[PDB]
Curated annotation (Swiss-Prot):
Protein name: Roundabout homolog 1
Location of this fragment in the whole protein: 660 to 885 of 1651
The gene coding this protein: ROBO1
Tissue expression summary: Widely expressed, with exception of kidney.
Superkingdom per UniProt: Eukaryota
Family: Belongs to the immunoglobulin superfamily. ROBO family.
Carbohydrate-modified residues: N158, N165
Subunit structure: Homodimer. Dimerization is mediated by the extracellular domain and is independent of SLIT liganding. Interacts with SLIT1. Interacts with SLIT2. Interacts with FLRT3. Interacts with MYO9B (via Rho-GAP domain).
Amino acid sequence: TSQGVDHKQVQRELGNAVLHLHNPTVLSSSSIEVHWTVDQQSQYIQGYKILYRPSGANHGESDWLVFEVRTPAKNSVVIPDLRKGVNYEIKARPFFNEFQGADSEIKFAKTLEEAPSAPPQGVTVSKNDTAILVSWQPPPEDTQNGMVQEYKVWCLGNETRYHINKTVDGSTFSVVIPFLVPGIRYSVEVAASTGAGSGVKSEPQFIQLDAHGNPVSPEDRVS
């Protein structure tokens, strides 16, 4: 019990192995490359811990995911399996067995956005007080794949020569379509768009107005 390391010595050296974390390099919608340089490398060094987590409410210093780099010779690594279009917080520290060095500076990097992988929810078409009001709610946050920049509304007549398109910003959840040609069934679909493009369209809601401008149900047609 007399020929091991001096923990005070190991802790000091490890603490002095200053890990300088560079600006992360975003590789894809689900991966980010981290790179670092170490000044005054410790003579006790097993590797590095890369701590990372998405933006959002968290529970402090214990609330991180950990990617363990098990060799001191590496100066970079790819963090895979990340949420799409999400801002990440990243830091790194050297370690040697049970001992850990000091955390690097904190860095932030956002994975690449993709088009939303789910449609807007609750798409509804209503007579507006020959105009209709189209209303919806955003796709589930976890399907958005980034910040929603706008919503695209398509209003397509059964006779496709009749069509109307509308764009509203990402904080707008309804839009008025002023005029529909009476007697024509229109299909209404909405898609959310991030910076990476338009996502999946909602399955169509149908509406047809009579000459008075009032909705005629499918049931009422066959009459």
